[PDB]
Amino acid sequence: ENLINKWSLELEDQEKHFLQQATQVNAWDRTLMQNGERIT
Amino acid sequence: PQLLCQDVENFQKFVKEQKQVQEEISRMSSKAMLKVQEDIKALKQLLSVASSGLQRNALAIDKLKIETA
Amino acid sequence: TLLGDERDAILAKWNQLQAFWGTGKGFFMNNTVQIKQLIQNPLSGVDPIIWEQAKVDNPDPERLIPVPMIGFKELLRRLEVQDQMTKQHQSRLDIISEDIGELQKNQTTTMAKIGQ
Prior knowledge:
This is part of a larger assembly, with chains A (40 residues), B (69 residues) and C (116 residues).
Chain A: H1 2-39
Chain B: H1 2-27, H2 32-68
Chain C: H1 2-13, E1 26-30, H2 34-38, H3 48-57, E2 65-69, H4 71-115
Antiparallel strand pairs in C: 1-2
């Protein structure tokens, strides 16, 4: 039952990290749009 | 049990492979985005400087026209 | 056995099949009447419910429509789009700056002619 534990653990961990990653991507996209406006 | 012990390995393999995509996103961190706002804020002030130069030129233009007349 | 079922949950967790996609379900606002054509009749496999909740929580709905983000590989593709847009962006800033600089040089020459 050990590897089964590590499976769920890595799941939760990397999932939290990837969620924060998608969030940083969303922020970068927000900034790209906002600066594109000033460029226009 | 072989079925169970093979499903465990294939499942953890799939999960670890998706964790690899998490790792790729971790690598992908973006900063030129942070630079874009600076570039635009500078482009605005530079265009404003050009505007100020031309607005100073227009009054000299009117002076030239009237005096030449 | 609840062990194999927890394992099945772990297996569907980190995966591209959107079977409770590892709590990796995340939505991005990709800029965009044809809107109302696309944003409904839901997307490639996102749940209608969460997609409607996203269109509900999407900021700048005129400046952005909902777009499915699929795991962190999609975050990677998104950061690639971001870098490409940033390149074009600083390049456009460069075009604008070149225009401004040409304006200032020619304006200086015009002003010097004014004195003559």
